[PDB]
Protein: Enoyl-CoA hydratase/isomerase
Organism: Nitrosopumilus maritimus
Amino acid sequence: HMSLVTTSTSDGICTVKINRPDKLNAMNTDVAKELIKTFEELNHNDDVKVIILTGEGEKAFSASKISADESVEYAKTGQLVTATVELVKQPTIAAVNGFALGGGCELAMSCDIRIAADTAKLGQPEVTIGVPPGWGGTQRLMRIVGIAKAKELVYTGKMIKAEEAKEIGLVNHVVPLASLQEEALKMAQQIAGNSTMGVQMSKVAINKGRNADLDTGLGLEILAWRNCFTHPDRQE
Amino acid sequence: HMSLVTTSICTVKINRPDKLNAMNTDVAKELIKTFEENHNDDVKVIILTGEGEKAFSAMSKISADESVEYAKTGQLVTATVELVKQPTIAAVNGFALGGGCELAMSCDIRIAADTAKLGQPEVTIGVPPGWGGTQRLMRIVGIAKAKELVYTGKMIKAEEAKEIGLVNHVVPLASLQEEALKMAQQIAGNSTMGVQMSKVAINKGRNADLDTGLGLEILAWRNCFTHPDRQE
Amino acid sequence: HMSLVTTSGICTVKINRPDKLNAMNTDVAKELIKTFEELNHNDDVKVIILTGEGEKAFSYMSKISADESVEYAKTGQLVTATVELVKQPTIAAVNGFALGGGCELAMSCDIRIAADTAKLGQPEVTIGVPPGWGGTQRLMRIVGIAKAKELVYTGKMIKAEEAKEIGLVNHVVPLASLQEEALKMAQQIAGNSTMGVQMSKVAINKGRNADLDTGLGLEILAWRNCFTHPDRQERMT
Amino acid sequence: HMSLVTTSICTVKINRPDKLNAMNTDVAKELIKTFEHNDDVKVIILTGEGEKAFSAMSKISADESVEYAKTGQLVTATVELVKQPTIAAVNGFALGGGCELAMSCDIRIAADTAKLGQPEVTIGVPPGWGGTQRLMRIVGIAKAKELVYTGKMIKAEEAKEIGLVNHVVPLASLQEEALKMAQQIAGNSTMGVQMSKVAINKGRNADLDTGLGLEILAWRNCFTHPDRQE
Amino acid sequence: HMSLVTTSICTVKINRPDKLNAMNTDVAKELIKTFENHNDDVKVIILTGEGEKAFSASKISADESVEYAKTGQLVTATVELVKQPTIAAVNGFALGGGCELAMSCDIRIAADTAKLGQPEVTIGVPPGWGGTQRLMRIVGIAKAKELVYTGKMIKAEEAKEIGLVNHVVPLASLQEEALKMAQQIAGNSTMGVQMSKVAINKGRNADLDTGLGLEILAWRNCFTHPDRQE
Amino acid sequence: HMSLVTTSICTVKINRPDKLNAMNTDVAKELIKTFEHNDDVKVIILTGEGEKAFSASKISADESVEYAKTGQLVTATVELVKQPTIAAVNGFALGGGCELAMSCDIRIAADTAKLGQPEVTIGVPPGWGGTQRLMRIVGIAKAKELVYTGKMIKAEEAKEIGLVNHVVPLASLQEEALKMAQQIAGNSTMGVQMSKVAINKGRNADLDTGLGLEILAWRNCFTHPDRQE
């Protein structure tokens, strides 16, 4: 179904793995709901400080004859899992180990930081079926890579390698697969070394001010800044 | 002023070659009429390029009052090219300067020739970009490069245009059209309803917060799921 | 304190405190506010160059309450907004270290040209706080949410080359060639229409915060304003 | 399908009182072309022909629905973003598109006989000409939700109560009042009025700081006009 | 902590009458999961306080105060964004979290004995379940600032004049009225009703053009439904 | 010049009664300086001196920009000040004064008060935030009516459209103001001004972003002694 295992310094680095390698870690509603409950619906426990999310099998991160009314609930489940991943307390590092197409790519775009392997191919092929990307791909892909590249990808519904994904910023870095998880830990243990209060107030400020004008975002930032100043992490 | 060829995809061309396909009021009105305020259901993808293979597109001495009208005509034609039903592929065959560049920035995807040169030199004569440059260039390449290009008013070549994201790809001149064709056809084979509703969703959610954009997307997604292209 | 040198209408502003690596306290912030506020009324100056004194750096009193924390953050927001919304375009010549409030200061300018020795970053979280002078917003609005999140969460420094790769700076030139380079671009902006330049700046800084239609309204208003100016009819010759 | 009378102030009247000036496609196009403006007109009054109706077949494709809702959006936007102000003199029924058309105008002055509403939901659709947004932006979210979910008529007194209309006067004296407000606006500066309209119509969609940028740009533009110094 | 009764329309009632139906986290969870998603048999939801005396009338860990506020946000959003229209029948006291919950609903009909307010600032905190935003979005910034800064209570008449409630009726006949409006919404097309709800709840947060895009999408989406022809 | 008197609540007064407390550049500058606040003051009262008025064509376009910037600066300084502000409209509030009144949080007007935006009768729009603040306070329809007509309105219809919070007899206006200022001053200072920050920021954003602002201010207040005591 889904795996979790935690160790780091303080050992609060939690690797979360999608466990369906027989079907290329494809995401159905069961995987979405289990992801929602693993990310605990907009919070977490206090042991974990950084989350590294990937899919087992070393081949794919994650790669409808239905009831037009039921597709609204389907897209709602997708939106809910993407928001639960996107707004979790700790930072998330998406280790894209191979294919990330459709929902999978959307999942990858819900995370804060993406470290892809030189074997990773991303895309949104929903438009080849007759549907748009229904789990936030029409919005998050734009907000990450620019309207031009997002439009190109969604219109063509094509697949792009991790190198051009790094070129357009869809992934933060590209490393060899053999080193992928290694790098995924190396960044995480770096974020875990910093103050959790500062890191996660920064995350709240960023995730809230991405949707507002500069003045409102600065208000969010100053409020989070005072909040962190009321914390012992600042003085020690 | 106009050129239309539709075979599959409708290539539209600005037919003013002896003036580097310059933008004016008549050309803007012709483009407005050509983009049909939507399109006909036969066309799936549109390619906008310039005649002569020397310039994509490279009367202002008057009356700020009707300068408002000139800017309104520019905004109208840029929004008609931007919000047209079919996707738009801009094949900049050289000079895309000022109103041309802004025009090129109205389309969804820009494919550049190696000889292409883009920029907003309005700041050198008397004015800011008045046909959407100050907003569209920012929304395409980011505020830093937008400010650099607008303040300096300089021209940049195609390679640095793809470096900052103003154009999606750069290909040799002699193979630009072809390449455009291919991409258009790669978009033409996809679902009409899917592509066009995703275009609606993107063009609407670019201006709103993530939640409102997700609402737009779920509405477009249901609308497509009520269409036969989804199941077949 | 702070040094000013103007000629061409090109004004170079220098943070003058090399003993503390041009560190940002409330004094230098207030002096920056006062210098950029005067330049708003200075009609000779056309372009502003912001850089640090010396060849090393462009630019922790926190024993304090949370209310004086709010006041410190407000002073930082004020200096960043005054630099950002100044009349003339600004060129931040990052001649070395730009970390913390210094990097946010550089991010408040219109254009950044960094030396090949420059290192930029937001190490705020390494001492328990987020960026307090607009980093969490301006960094994301300049380089995108992905790289902004990476840099803010790690709190690491990055060389000028990767800063140019992610858009944190516009260009990267050798250190000894930085100053000259900056002035060159400033010259290229100084020769343009001041009316058009500054209405462009107003339109951009206002439309970055709104939908496309409101930004187009701002643009058409600035366009008519410029069309009421003699620069328009006089240079379109 | 439409009448113009410029006497000074242009009164605009939709002309189909046979079934109370309903909003077809053709009157939408006629209103679009009529709202184009010229320098003569300073204020616009838009009312319905028939003395008791301002403006009061569909199982065809969803794509035609999209494009005719786009036509409605276009006519409402053309009415909403004119140079001069618009005074909607609601003489009677304003339901569905009509009321949406009335909500596109700057100011509404209704007769005491006027009943407004959005009954689209009694047919199986939402208001597709801007009601779901303009009604909410005029009367607030609570009253807008109430009116769109009920789809009922309300009397002009309740419209003035919830802000859907600015003022309520007797029908026989509606036009005199609308033209009174018109000539009050036309006596003011054309540049100031029209730049105020641009600033309001653009800043309603933005944060306060952006809107203040809009306002300062329009303010500078008004200071370049001869109407200021005199 | 809360009960449900459906017939034709579903009434949801906070069942804590001796505690004046006050809200803690557990009743919030019960309401969260009682608004599920939903089933297709319910058309209009009426939420009121059990006991016809009050609709609905913190010493650790600011860290856990964040989670308390997140639970409040979750319950308010689940009530607000839910499929069917919601009618808040405030039967008396609606203070603090209770009034915020009432403001999450679509339409509010108050008994003449109702008293609403946000007294959070008398404790040392702002409204933490959406008051600072929803009150301002319902009644406007001036009255919202007044009520939040004073923390005072207001009767049904003043809350109606400021738009905090849509209508005010006698207490002994509140629910009946709350029923009839519900009935009035039940007879309307569920597809049109709920697509209008989605369009409004999404376009209240965006500019006019984005809201019009949402509206035209929902308009075609109601043209997808068979209830348009019948 | 202007004056200030602190008693607990600092009453701030525009001291130009022989000119109906009209606004110039010097008045705006001294108002910016007065609104700076100090930790003792909990509520601010802004009114005009004299019981007659709260506050009632040579420049180029560039100094017109500068004048509009000064007006925006003073209106934003009053609007975003720490403590809640009560504008006691003791008569005329026209033009900038009107806009000044619209910058405060709460407006209590005397029955003889008259509010308006007459800029459009001179050739210009409101340039101190009227075209935005009036629409955000009273709605778009009444703001359009008032700005296009440029007409003065009495206190009661100003209350009807929401331009003022309450209408009080002139002879008692101040006292009523003080009374409200007392009721607000007794509440939590930290909670009330964090509420003010949340409101002034979330008025410009969508619901989700505003709720983020609110939850941040709420957590901030939970770290203050006022919450538990």
User: Anything to note?
Assistant: Chain A has two domains: 1-194, 195-236. The interface with chain E takes residues 42-43, 68, 73, 76, 227, 230 of chain A (CB under 8 Å). The CA atoms of residues 9 and 25 of chain A lie 29 Å apart. Residues 70-86 of chain A form the longest helix (17 residues).
